[PDB]
Amino acid sequence: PPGPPGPPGPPGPPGPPGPPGPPGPPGPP
Amino acid sequence: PPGPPGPPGPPGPPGPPGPPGPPGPPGPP
């Protein structure tokens, strides 16, 4: 009869980069 | 005969951090 299932595949690729950070603080007076 | 293919692998790792945010607003007068 058929053999067992094969092993799991490898991990997928990395996700995309995250979103941009927030604006910086206001400048000096 | 050989068995069926294995299951899909695990999800990949998270992506890297996103880019820096924009510069802040101008300071007060």
Added chain:
Amino acid sequence: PPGPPGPPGPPGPPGPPGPPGPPGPPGPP
């Protein structure tokens, strides 16, 4: 014999937000 390995897994999630931007420019005189 065992089947072939499964396919690669799905992509990972998006990365974390980026760092804040730098301070804005000085205010008007």
